[PDB]
Design a protein around this ligand. Sequence first.
Ligand SMILES: [Mg+2]
Ligand SMILES: [Mg+2]
Ligand SMILES: [Mg+2]
Ligand SMILES: [Mg+2]
Ligand SMILES: [Mg+2]
Ligand SMILES: [Mg+2]
Ligand SMILES: [Mg+2]
Ligand SMILES: [Mg+2]
Ligand SMILES: [Mg+2]
Ligand SMILES: [Mg+2]
Ligand SMILES: [Mg+2]
Ligand SMILES: [Mg+2]
Ligand SMILES: [Mg+2]
Ligand SMILES: [Mg+2]
Ligand SMILES: [Mg+2]
Ligand SMILES: [Mg+2]
Ligand SMILES: [Mg+2]
Ligand SMILES: [Mg+2]
Ligand SMILES: [Mg+2]
Ligand SMILES: [Mg+2]
Ligand SMILES: [Mg+2]
Ligand SMILES: [Mg+2]
Ligand SMILES: [Mg+2]
Ligand SMILES: [Mg+2]
Ligand SMILES: [Mg+2]
Ligand SMILES: [Mg+2]
Ligand SMILES: [Mg+2]
Ligand SMILES: [Mg+2]
Ligand SMILES: [Mg+2]
Ligand SMILES: [Mg+2]
Ligand SMILES: [Mg+2]
Ligand SMILES: [Mg+2]
Ligand SMILES: [Mg+2]
Ligand SMILES: [Mg+2]
Ligand SMILES: [Mg+2]
Ligand SMILES: [Mg+2]
Ligand SMILES: [Mg+2]
Ligand SMILES: [Mg+2]
Ligand SMILES: [Mg+2]
Ligand SMILES: [Mg+2]
Ligand SMILES: [Mg+2]
Ligand SMILES: [Mg+2]
Ligand SMILES: [Mg+2]
Ligand SMILES: [Mg+2]
Ligand SMILES: [Mg+2]
Ligand SMILES: [Mg+2]
Ligand SMILES: [Mg+2]
Ligand SMILES: [Mg+2]
Ligand SMILES: [Mg+2]
Ligand SMILES: [Mg+2]
Ligand SMILES: [Mg+2]
Ligand SMILES: [Mg+2]
Ligand SMILES: [Mg+2]
Ligand SMILES: [Mg+2]
Ligand SMILES: [Mg+2]
Ligand SMILES: [Mg+2]
Ligand SMILES: [Mg+2]
Ligand SMILES: [Mg+2]
Ligand SMILES: [Mg+2]
Ligand SMILES: [Mg+2]
Ligand SMILES: [Mg+2]
Ligand SMILES: [Mg+2]
Ligand SMILES: [Mg+2]
Ligand SMILES: [Mg+2]
Ligand SMILES: [Mg+2]
Ligand SMILES: [Mg+2]
Ligand SMILES: [Mg+2]
Ligand SMILES: [Mg+2]
Ligand SMILES: [Mg+2]
Ligand SMILES: [Mg+2]
Ligand SMILES: [Mg+2]
Ligand SMILES: [Mg+2]
Ligand SMILES: [Mg+2]
Ligand SMILES: [Mg+2]
Ligand SMILES: [Mg+2]
Ligand SMILES: [Mg+2]
Ligand SMILES: [Mg+2]
Ligand SMILES: [Mg+2]
Ligand SMILES: [Mg+2]
Ligand SMILES: [Mg+2]
Ligand SMILES: [Mg+2]
Ligand SMILES: [Mg+2]
Ligand SMILES: [Mg+2]
Ligand SMILES: [Mg+2]
Ligand SMILES: [Mg+2]
Ligand SMILES: [Mg+2]
Ligand SMILES: [Mg+2]
Ligand SMILES: [Mg+2]
Ligand SMILES: [Mg+2]
Ligand SMILES: [Mg+2]
Lengths: 244, 15
Amino acid sequence: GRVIRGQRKGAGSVFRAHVKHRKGAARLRAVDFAERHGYIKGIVKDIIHDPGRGAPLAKVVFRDPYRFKKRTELFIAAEGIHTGQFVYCGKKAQLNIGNVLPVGTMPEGTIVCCLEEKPGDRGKLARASGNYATVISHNPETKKTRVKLPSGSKKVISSANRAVVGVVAGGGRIDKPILKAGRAYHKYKAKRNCWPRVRGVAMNPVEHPFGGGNHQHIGKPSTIRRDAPAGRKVGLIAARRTGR
Amino acid sequence: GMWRFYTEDSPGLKV
RNA sequence: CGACUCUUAGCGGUGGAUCACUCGGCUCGUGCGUCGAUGAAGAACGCAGCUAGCUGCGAGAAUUAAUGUGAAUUGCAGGACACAUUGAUCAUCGACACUUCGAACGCACUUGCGGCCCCGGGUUCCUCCCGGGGCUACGCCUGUCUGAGCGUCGCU
RNA sequence: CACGAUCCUUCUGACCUUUUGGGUUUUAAGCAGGAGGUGUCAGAAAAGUUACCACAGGGAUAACUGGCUUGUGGCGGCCAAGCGUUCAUAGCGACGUCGCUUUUUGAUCCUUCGAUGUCGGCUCUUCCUAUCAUUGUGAAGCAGAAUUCACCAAGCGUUGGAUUGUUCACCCACUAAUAGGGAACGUGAGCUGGGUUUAGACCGUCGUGAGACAGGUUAGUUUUACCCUACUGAUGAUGUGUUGUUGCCAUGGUAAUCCUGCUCAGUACGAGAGGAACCGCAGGUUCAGACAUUUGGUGUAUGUGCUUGGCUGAGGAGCCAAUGGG
RNA sequence: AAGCAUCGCGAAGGCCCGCGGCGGGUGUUGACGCGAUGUGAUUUCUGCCCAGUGCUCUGAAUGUCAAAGUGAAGAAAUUCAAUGAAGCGCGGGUAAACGGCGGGAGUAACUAUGACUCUCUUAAGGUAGCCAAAUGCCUCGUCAUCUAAUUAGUGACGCGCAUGAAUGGAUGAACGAGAUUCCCACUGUCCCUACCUACUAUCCAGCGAAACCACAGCCAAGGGAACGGGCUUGGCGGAAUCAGCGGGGAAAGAAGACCCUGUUGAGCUUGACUCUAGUCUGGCACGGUGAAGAGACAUGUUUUUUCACUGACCCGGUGAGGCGG
RNA sequence: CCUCUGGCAUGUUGGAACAAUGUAGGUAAGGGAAGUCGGCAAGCCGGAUCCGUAACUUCGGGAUAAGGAUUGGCUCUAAGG
RNA sequence: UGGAGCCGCCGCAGGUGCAGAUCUUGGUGGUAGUAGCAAAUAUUCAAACGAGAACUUUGAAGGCCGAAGUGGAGAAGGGUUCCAUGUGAACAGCAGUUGAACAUGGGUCAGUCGGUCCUGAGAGAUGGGCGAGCGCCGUUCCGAAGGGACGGGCGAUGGCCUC
RNA sequence: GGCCCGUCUCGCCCGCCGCGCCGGGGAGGUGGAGCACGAGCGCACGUGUUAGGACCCGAAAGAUGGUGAACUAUGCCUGGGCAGGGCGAAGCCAGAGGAAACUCUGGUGGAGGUCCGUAGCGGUCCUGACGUGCAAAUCGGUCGUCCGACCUGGGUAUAGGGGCGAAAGACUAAUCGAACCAUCUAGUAGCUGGUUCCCUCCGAAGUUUCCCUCAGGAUAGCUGGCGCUCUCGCACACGCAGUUU
RNA sequence: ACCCACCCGACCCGUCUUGAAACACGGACCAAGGAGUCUAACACGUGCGCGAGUCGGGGGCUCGCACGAAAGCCGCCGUGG
RNA sequence: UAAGGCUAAAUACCGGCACGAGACCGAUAGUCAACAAGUACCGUAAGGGAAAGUUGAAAAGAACUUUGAAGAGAGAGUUCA
RNA sequence: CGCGACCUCAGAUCAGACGUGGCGACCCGCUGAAUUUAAGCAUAUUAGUCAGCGGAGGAGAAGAAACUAACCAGGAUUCCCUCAGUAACGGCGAGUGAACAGGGAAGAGCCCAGCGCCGAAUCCCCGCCCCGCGGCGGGGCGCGGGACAUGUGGCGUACGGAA
Ligand SMILES: [Mg+2]
Ligand SMILES: [Mg+2]
Ligand SMILES: [Mg+2]
Ligand SMILES: [Mg+2]
Ligand SMILES: [Mg+2]
Ligand SMILES: [Mg+2]
Ligand SMILES: [Mg+2]
Ligand SMILES: [Mg+2]
Ligand SMILES: [Mg+2]
Ligand SMILES: [Mg+2]
Ligand SMILES: [Mg+2]
Ligand SMILES: [Mg+2]
Ligand SMILES: [Mg+2]
Ligand SMILES: [Mg+2]
Ligand SMILES: [Mg+2]
Ligand SMILES: [Mg+2]
Ligand SMILES: [Mg+2]
Ligand SMILES: [Mg+2]
Ligand SMILES: [Mg+2]
Ligand SMILES: [Mg+2]
Ligand SMILES: [Mg+2]
Ligand SMILES: [Mg+2]
Ligand SMILES: [Mg+2]
Ligand SMILES: [Mg+2]
Ligand SMILES: [Mg+2]
Ligand SMILES: [Mg+2]
Ligand SMILES: [Mg+2]
Ligand SMILES: [Mg+2]
Ligand SMILES: [Mg+2]
Ligand SMILES: [Mg+2]
Ligand SMILES: [Mg+2]
Ligand SMILES: [Mg+2]
Ligand SMILES: [Mg+2]
Ligand SMILES: [Mg+2]
Ligand SMILES: [Mg+2]
Ligand SMILES: [Mg+2]
Ligand SMILES: [Mg+2]
Ligand SMILES: [Mg+2]
Ligand SMILES: [Mg+2]
Ligand SMILES: [Mg+2]
Ligand SMILES: [Mg+2]
Ligand SMILES: [Mg+2]
Ligand SMILES: [Mg+2]
Ligand SMILES: [Mg+2]
Ligand SMILES: [Mg+2]
Ligand SMILES: [Mg+2]
Ligand SMILES: [Mg+2]
Ligand SMILES: [Mg+2]
Ligand SMILES: [Mg+2]
Ligand SMILES: [Mg+2]
Ligand SMILES: [Mg+2]
Ligand SMILES: [Mg+2]
Ligand SMILES: [Mg+2]
Ligand SMILES: [Mg+2]
Ligand SMILES: [Mg+2]
Ligand SMILES: [Mg+2]
Ligand SMILES: [Mg+2]
Ligand SMILES: [Mg+2]
Ligand SMILES: [Mg+2]
Ligand SMILES: [Mg+2]
Ligand SMILES: [Mg+2]
Ligand SMILES: [Mg+2]
Ligand SMILES: [Mg+2]
Ligand SMILES: [Mg+2]
Ligand SMILES: [Mg+2]
Ligand SMILES: [Mg+2]
Ligand SMILES: [Mg+2]
Ligand SMILES: [Mg+2]
Ligand SMILES: [Mg+2]
Ligand SMILES: [Mg+2]
Ligand SMILES: [Mg+2]
Ligand SMILES: [Mg+2]
Ligand SMILES: [Mg+2]
Ligand SMILES: [Mg+2]
Ligand SMILES: [Mg+2]
Ligand SMILES: [Mg+2]
Ligand SMILES: [Mg+2]
Ligand SMILES: [Mg+2]
Ligand SMILES: [Mg+2]
Ligand SMILES: [Mg+2]
Ligand SMILES: [Mg+2]
Ligand SMILES: [Mg+2]
Ligand SMILES: [Mg+2]
Ligand SMILES: [Mg+2]
Ligand SMILES: [Mg+2]
Ligand SMILES: [Mg+2]
Ligand SMILES: [Mg+2]
Ligand SMILES: [Mg+2]
Ligand SMILES: [Mg+2]
Ligand SMILES: [Mg+2]
């Protein structure tokens, strides 16, 4: 019968992200002669809170090296950053915390965050709240490097691509219980319309494959193909193993 | 015309 | 017989059938076969001595001019006119005119903001200020001017 | 009796026809006979569910009532083998048999599907008798007491509660007795809505599932009378010349009920245990018809005090607070 | 709903929109995230079953498997051959995936039950718990308790028609316009009704509707489409009205929601029949350069394998700001 | 709940009665849920001060638990800047 | 009665005959002078006007709303309902001397109160892309997307070409 | 009996520019909507049967293209709103005890999807009023909540097999298990209902076989109408029967 | 034919139905409207014309059509059916 | 003789302008519309969508008297009525 | 590091033109159902039909054979009669369904590219004069611009054409 919640999310409208009070996209600096060859220094003017983001950001002010002009950036704050700190960045950047250098330079066992997945992308992996990647090992020829992400996957990467040293700030956020529904409500009110979530079993059988029945049961296996048309693809999508 | 009975009243109900 | 009720008739009411009319339709046929940036169709707002509606018209607004016609128009006024005079009234319509939206065109739809040329007050080009006029849509064609390119060459 | 049309397919058959401007050869199409099947067998290619439901209709068809029927249920005879210490028949009654009843349930499908409101309870009237009690009596295996059996008989009665939606059931208690039934399984414009029997939900079982369940659970709108009649009361009506009076009475209706105590009497009767009755007297129950002297209830005589908050400057006199409160 | 627990996804990605786009939402995001499910605070637990249906993992070792391409004979349409992707099959994993979780016999020096033993059988055979519960047919189960009396309530029992573990089991303070049961108090709920007040109803002035209506309107019985206002046979019948009343008009209402028929439908479902967006795979096309080599056939051809390259094509960044020599 | 400022004419009419049924309010002897499916409905309770407070509990609660006492008027006293 | 057209015969032609269709449109009954004009405590006395007063107005008294108002001002919506004078046909479910009715006239004055300007969520042209197509997508993305400014120079005119 | 065309069976002869896998006949069966001295064509009227809106009125549906979020659902932007009490969380102070650890006592403090309770928001029970209403869902009392997943104005977003849904198949302008508006559309109906003047004559059937047939058709039967061919009461009859012999 | 009396007879129509006065449905009353049509195709019957033919269309020739969008005629008279 | 192009005529015509006619309809008919009709009115909007003709030849449309607050009457008069 | 050709591309309120919307009976191009019929239904049918979008004209479209035929042959298109409810299609069911010939209405035929020849022999726009001017045209005259050899004009196009 109906289009199920899930399918409607793609259309946007009501399920678009709430983004008025968000401070900006949380990127690294753009590459340039300075970053590519030496190091550009910039100070941390303030640390901020960004709605719908666990991590804190940092307003970091550089000087544009072509026009007399003080550019500014929004880094994801590595934990241990403070205001009135200097943040150095580039190839000849030193290996301390809050210091974006190319993964290639930094040694094995180096902890990083806001890691560029591709060179020049301005910081894509491991940038949540208490998260970090680890540089495993370099392959000098091929100019490539191996990195262990937060998920536990070990991804290969161009030595060129950069990442900030140290973990992300605002760690352990998920340790505190929420307790109140309201405290959940307020969390997702800063993000998007995704919260008080009705179980498919409760729904009639027009608004969910699991719906209907004189008992709240599923009635078909809750695992499912991922060669599955959007509508059925519900429950445990291509679940390799399902249990505890 | 006059209202008479509600829709779910169905006056002479003999199920 | 008394009142009431019923029936029938007379007259009267209620109601608007029937009949009789018909500046309306419906159908068939004939001829022509024409809209619009030179601003259409449509919409809006206006316009009469007294006029609300319909119709008619556009700030020249129940119409101007012209031509034909030849004494009205008429609900009441008032008037005109010498109806032996371009001359009332109608008709025709070739000249003139035609508010604002609208393809809708300076940009916006508040009826709001503008730019650029010329003119009058205002100055004595002092720019202001006010008023008036004329331009200021997109697309595309032919040409025109100014240009761009480590596009292809030449001469220096 | 042991079997199958069109269309399609397949095979077989002839020096066969056509395969299109002509000719050769493949191919295809024809013609004629078999075979491949339609068992819903004169021959569609086809799974559920709906309580979220809809439409056209149907009393050609169910779920009430009411009809017929009466198997089944209930009630009642005949016969008499037995029981009854003895004795078929006081009271019973086998094996058989004949009936009635429509307060059981079935059969049935006549009536109603442009709808006859679907269980119970409450309330109220009336009718029946197949009589529990009470009146009058016949019987006994009736000494008395208690008693069953039968007759006239439906006048009068036939209750209060615990559980349950219940009908039904059971138990407590009282009683004279706690008999049984009918009236559209009396009675929803009388109520109620606890239950069945929409929609929400829960559980179990069943179903892959949607969903199902005379399986359990909880939540869930009960409309209209002012018409006619009926009944209740209320004015009136024709007659008698008019009016009043005091009256008669046709017809309708109708009412009383049952119990206890005392006495008879510890008497009859009885071995005793136990244990009556008639006439009297004193009272009570249920019902009926009145009434307010008394007791009680009401009370806005807004009667008279008392009191809260406020308001007429205060006193006094009052008012307001949907009847200020008492 | 927090809490718990699963699942997918490292971005040319997961999930999803869109008729289409170098389209879009999540995403101003990056696993302490986004997406998809279940269960439902805490406490305490969460047994066994991978046989079935799902999901998933691997894959020349391999059954089948299409179009193209390759060979074959044929005059050609062609037929035949080999070749062979996903998917099925084959083989593992998975139950906080859908779900599922037994039946006989005999046995203890009174009897009874049966610790014990014997079989037959499954993928195991219901573990911990819990119970005649909102789940128990029989059923008003039995025993206790609560009452003078209890198909009710509570506590036990368990044989459980048909309880049971995130289809969550067992618990549980606080809370609940939630479902029951009893007690205290309180009461017109009742015995059993009464009186009082206001607004109505009532009568008048003024004003003034509607539904409904074949004709109408007293009964008994009869017969009748098997319950009559009318018909038959009886009883009977007296103008015009008022306030009431709910017996009857099988009163009004709405072309029965029930039930059945119709070759009438819709909503939903799936192992119905027929399709389809999407998705997965294979072919041809845009599609190039060089290197190496390798088989297969033949005595050059085809198949190409792997490794580079960059010029198409794609992606990212930037105010295209220092690129390679 | 009563009042001033300000605002109204009792909500589309009046009059006369004071029957039954109603709608909305009250009160009831003795009993006290015997009523009913069921305490439905109404009634009890209620404010403050002072005492006093159980089971159970996630130790927070439960809790206004429950159960008691007092409360006016007047005339003083003491204590707080 | 009515006041202008109409008929017989022979042929032809039809939108040719009504009691029903819960028929269609219009009209009228009985019901019926009936149901009814019962939510939110409340009225009374005098005078005035007037044909006429339960209801208008004035005065007096008694009442209510009781500053979370039945008071005083706005928003949206209405659109002349505002104010005055006059009318008593209709309407205002009795009445009316009254009214938001009807008929005549009147009435809204801003540099400062608001629109107007800004951006918000969003909407939406161009470039580009898609699209059989009306178009759609898209809003910074596959753009040669700035027409402005200062200072200098050179030219031209307009001016006591001085400045 | 005969003839023609198909078809079979059997048989014996003819023909010539081309003698042949040529052509032509015969006899006897058997298929044909055939011939056997023609009856059609045109026009008109009637009845019947169809195809069409098709006697009239009637669905539930289906499709195409548009209008709506002024109600309500949810997101976003910007504004506004929420007496008086109770309980008394962390933090802090003092004092007392403790040898230390720290503990007690009295305060202060004002936490909370905390309690009562107004406005606001809601809508439990009376199964109260009303039920041709004040009202196409209102009124009274009684209730739930009242600093938060709180209430609310304006703006803006999402549109019909679509939206939105703390999930009731709820809501989407009194409409929702698929909105409204117009068209396709006079949709189809084996089923309800209706179907208009007079007289005259005749006058049925509910059975047959077949049918996705059993509320319907087909086919026989039963009816009517039109006729024709003959017959003879015109002293001059053959045939037939719901009999009997 | 208007009214009234009396005796006898006599239930309300329409409709589906085996069966309706029905406790079956539709119907308060009156007016006007209101449902077997037209086209095509077939069939049989009947009337008329011609008859191994028949035919008329379609076209053409004759008029501005008053009556005419008729009527008449055509080696088209028969391409053709 | 394809992969390029132009071309009058007979043919179509429920819109338009301007005419003509009818075995049509005759105000519940005929167009929704004989009339101030796509009007009034309704709906947020798409959209829906009415009713409604007739004095008489001529206004000669009732001067005047009188009752009444008036509406309404009674006489008088106009008209063939 | 200039200046100059061209090529490809920009910008102009540059000079002068055109297109945009409406109407929609008829016409051309797409798009395209489902009621419905089949007594069910899915192919079929309804139907290349309604709705949707686009573009016209007084008509449009079509049109001068890559045609019919198989004859002793006809000879663009369109229209009417006929072919014909035929050949054919089709759960070969329901249903659908043309064409050629024949007779009429009308009647009309042509032009390029190419291949070639001819001093680009051609075109557009400027500017001055004479006429003409309410459908911007003729004639003349300008070392006045441009278009054009990446091809303009005359001859010529299958019926043959050129010399
Ligand atoms: Mg649900
Ligand atoms: Mg589904
Ligand atoms: Mg299951
Ligand atoms: Mg050939
Ligand atoms: Mg259900
Ligand atoms: Mg059921
Ligand atoms: Mg129905
Ligand atoms: Mg029956
Ligand atoms: Mg029965
Ligand atoms: Mg014996
Ligand atoms: Mg009844
Ligand atoms: Mg007896
Ligand atoms: Mg009963
Ligand atoms: Mg009754
Ligand atoms: Mg009732
Ligand atoms: Mg109930
Ligand atoms: Mg239910
Ligand atoms: Mg009354
Ligand atoms: Mg005093
Ligand atoms: Mg799970
Ligand atoms: Mg488990
Ligand atoms: Mg498995
Ligand atoms: Mg166990
Ligand atoms: Mg009890
Ligand atoms: Mg128990
Ligand atoms: Mg289980
Ligand atoms: Mg379970
Ligand atoms: Mg009757
Ligand atoms: Mg009654
Ligand atoms: Mg009824
Ligand atoms: Mg019906
Ligand atoms: Mg059938
Ligand atoms: Mg269906
Ligand atoms: Mg549907
Ligand atoms: Mg299948
Ligand atoms: Mg009052
Ligand atoms: Mg009053
Ligand atoms: Mg009022
Ligand atoms: Mg009492
Ligand atoms: Mg009782
Ligand atoms: Mg009781
Ligand atoms: Mg209560
Ligand atoms: Mg407690
Ligand atoms: Mg006349
Ligand atoms: Mg006619
Ligand atoms: Mg009639
Ligand atoms: Mg009255
Ligand atoms: Mg008050
Ligand atoms: Mg005011
Ligand atoms: Mg106010
Ligand atoms: Mg006023
Ligand atoms: Mg009035
Ligand atoms: Mg026939
Ligand atoms: Mg017909
Ligand atoms: Mg219809
Ligand atoms: Mg369909
Ligand atoms: Mg109620
Ligand atoms: Mg009532
Ligand atoms: Mg009222
Ligand atoms: Mg449901
Ligand atoms: Mg019809
Ligand atoms: Mg049938
Ligand atoms: Mg029938
Ligand atoms: Mg009848
Ligand atoms: Mg009957
Ligand atoms: Mg019927
Ligand atoms: Mg009726
Ligand atoms: Mg008629
Ligand atoms: Mg004939
Ligand atoms: Mg052409
Ligand atoms: Mg009319
Ligand atoms: Mg009329
Ligand atoms: Mg009309
Ligand atoms: Mg008339
Ligand atoms: Mg009329
Ligand atoms: Mg008239
Ligand atoms: Mg008339
Ligand atoms: Mg006359
Ligand atoms: Mg155009
Ligand atoms: Mg069909
Ligand atoms: Mg059918
Ligand atoms: Mg069908
Ligand atoms: Mg077709
Ligand atoms: Mg169309
Ligand atoms: Mg043309
Ligand atoms: Mg050509
Ligand atoms: Mg031809
Ligand atoms: Mg023919
Ligand atoms: Mg076709
Ligand atoms: Mg040339």
